[PDB]
Write a structure and sequence with these properties.
Rossmann fold; Barwin-like endoglucanases; binds phosphothiophosphoric acid-adenylate ester; DNA damage (chains A, B); 451 residues; nucleus (chains A, B); part of a larger assembly; alpha/beta; DNA repair (chains A, B); RNA binding (chains A, B); 2 chains; hydrolase (chains A, B); binds magnesium ion
Amino acid sequence: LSTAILKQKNRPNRLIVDEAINEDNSVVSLSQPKMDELQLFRGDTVLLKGKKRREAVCIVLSDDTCSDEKIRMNRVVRNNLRVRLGDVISIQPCPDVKYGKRIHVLPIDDTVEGITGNLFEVYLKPYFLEAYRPIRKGDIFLVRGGMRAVEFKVVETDPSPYCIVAPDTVIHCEGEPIKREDEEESLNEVGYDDIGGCRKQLAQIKEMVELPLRHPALFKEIGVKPPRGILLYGPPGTGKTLIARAVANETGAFFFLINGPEIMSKLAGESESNLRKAFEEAEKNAPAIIFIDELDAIAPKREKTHGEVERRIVSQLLTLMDGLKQRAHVIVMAATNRPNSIDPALRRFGRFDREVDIGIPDATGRLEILQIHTKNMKLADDVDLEQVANETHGHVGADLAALCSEAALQAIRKKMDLIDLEDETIDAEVMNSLAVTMDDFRWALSQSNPS
Amino acid sequence: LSTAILKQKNRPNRLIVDEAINEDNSVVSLSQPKMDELQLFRGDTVLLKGKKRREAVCIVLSDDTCSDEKIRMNRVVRNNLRVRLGDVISIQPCPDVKYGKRIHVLPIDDTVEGITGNLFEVYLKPYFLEAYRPIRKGDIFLVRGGMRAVEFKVVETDPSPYCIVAPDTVIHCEGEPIKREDEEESLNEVGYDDIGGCRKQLAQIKEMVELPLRHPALFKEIGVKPPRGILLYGPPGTGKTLIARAVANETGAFFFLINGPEIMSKLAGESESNLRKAFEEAEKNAPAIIFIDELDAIAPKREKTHGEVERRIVSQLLTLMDGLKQRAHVIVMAATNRPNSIDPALRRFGRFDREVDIGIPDATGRLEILQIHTKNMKLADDVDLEQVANETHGHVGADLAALCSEAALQAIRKKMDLIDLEDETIDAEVMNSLAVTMDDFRWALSQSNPS
Ligand SMILES: Nc1ncnc2c1ncn2[C@@H]1O[C@H](COP(=O)(O)OP(=O)(O)OP(O)(O)=S)[C@@H](O)[C@H]1O
Ligand SMILES: Nc1ncnc2c1ncn2[C@@H]1O[C@H](COP(=O)(O)OP(=O)(O)OP(O)(O)=S)[C@@H](O)[C@H]1O
Ligand SMILES: [Mg+2]
Ligand SMILES: [Mg+2]
């Protein structure tokens, strides 16, 4: 009703992700009845939009067994789009794709332990030979070559970001293997889906930041000026910084982050430069979102604050906030867990003149969060999160995370007589046996604390 | 039960140290029934792991008189491994040992007072001649040559850290004699064993620092992120810094120590360089443990703190804590006796978000400590430590240490009419007669104080 901006719409080319029949990386299945509706001929190269602004490039074919409003893609494609089966994507005609000049690709470290021989020969040459594949920068794809299957990451393409791999395309694969861990962290980067029990506020954020920038005309037409300062506040640890993350990854805009404690670590005047530098960067690349985390760290009450350089910054900022022209298309967001200690001049109209309170979550919120956290954890069947949810009164997002981390340990703890700290490697059986029992949770629960 | 990580395991090659029959430095005795179990042929050169990450290299032979799960080594070997008879070690096959190019070895100062003649000729040449001995860098070994026995330290080896001493090996022994005192301090470097009444906490430390680094996969598998900030706290003098020591010596990781009072002694900005420098060093050499002692000295409440450079450091630190990437493999440990005065921003989730309280010890703890302290003291038979333990309620580690020191003096005091301060040297008889009587303790006890 006021969460309207969130419920996404039934549209011609929003299709649910179904498991692939055809097993190929560059292939996507569609119903014939649909392919026509979207004016898409066979073997056309298409553009796919996923989550957290991820993009994939594929070739399209008709599947008899595929529902109209569904689409098939393999796990490699589901990965580049950052979607689980059952999610929904944008399909778009990608007509002006140009042939590939040169591409640089590296293998992942934990997929090359063993023989080198020749990676191009054994793996890449065949996978690409006479294929004419579409690929995007930052694609991770798998190639099987006889005995092994190896994962490669598209480091660079000419032309960026996408090109077709033709016979003329020079393929460079020399370099240091990509580290798995880095690409783990990359998958794990935060989306909107990763924040729980904030639907109401998430709504407001999109309504005040995402909307005014994506469709500035709605405000033009209706004849009102969007607000340009949004201040999130909340009792410590309620995913304020966490949202800061989501937005960065999820936004359409050029995003610039400012960390109060990090600004204040700089030499006198060296911070003022950075403050301007940020606001200048944001204008230069507008539409933009500047985000200030731990605002209170740089904006205490000028009256009540002791150091001299220290007031200069509050003044410095105020000036910039005010120095934002109408035509600028910049929304300044910021966040604190101590709103009341921030200099009131900054909460005056035309500055940070909108607040989004990010409070304690209620019973169902906790349940939401608990789900989001455990989504990649090994849990026993006997684990009831609804129970946890109910028993965790007054916990916040960070309290819950801690809880999970604690039970996980307790679980690891129950294997601690079987294992010695000293051992070079761990018995591979036990490793697989490891899971968080509901009992583990009850222990963690018995240990929990105020926010 | 939750101290599980501590109880070490029965394993194929954990053997108890029994006194040697064969008296040679490079020799280790094993039961034949065992030697087979571990696929170890006679005259094979093995690797031995002791305490505080000490290592020894030997040649292995079968002893008929030696128990299966026992091993014989001389005191010279017991010394390089830093173990008393009755302790337990790792034995490991060391197959790829290379022949020695060049070795540099110096004698100990208090073992060479007298004739030089030629140390290589009299001592080293024969001890090594046609022997083909395995040696490690930092081994201390004893050589008898006619009238005297002399101790040598392995200063350098090529190749480091171990090599076999063949006839081709060039042996250099020129230089300044090693000072006994330094090597006394080296033996004395604190282990885990040296801390008493903290089993519960010791457990947590290994569980949060040692474990996440030695076996990062247990967390990977179970799908949870280990915490990266551990804050020890306790009433003054409870072996917080003492544990800082143990961990350094005992850990597998690269260890970097930061002393709050020492950071704060630096010029403005000179500290900020050191702070970064430390965090950079730790990343460069990961996995690593950064330890901050007397944290409260550098992290007072920014709000409540007066100097300007002073806040800049809290900000400076916070930034770095946060600037730690996931792939970094660094755990920041720190310690204070005044937790409540530390800026709360540092105890937020993802910073110092785990605490280990290092409280007063109970009756048995005191007894533990008293034992650890007196382990190298001259005590009369009439001395009952259980008594002391019971009578010392409310003492902490440092209180107990003081007590011992005080009684020791009282003992020295009882010789003070026999001795005059003026004398150039002390009557050698009385020296040997000196011991701490239980009465001495009762005096020290009568003088004791709150923590
Ligand atoms: N609403 C939430 N949904 C899911 N996870 C959360 C939520 N809130 C907190 N968490 C977890 O707790 C961690 C800390 O959250 P942050 O966003 O850093 O807290 P914060 O609100 O910024 O705290 P302050 O005010 O800076 S002390 C996050 O990395 C999440 O893992
Ligand atoms: N748990 C303990 N076990 C054995 N000895 C201890 C213990 N605690 C203290 N001691 C002795 O007392 C000395 C002082 O201990 P420290 O570790 O320096 O105290 P601390 O807890 O760091 O005190 P603060 O907080 O810096 S005043 C150590 O060098 C030990 O000799
Ligand atoms: Mg935050
Ligand atoms: Mg100390």
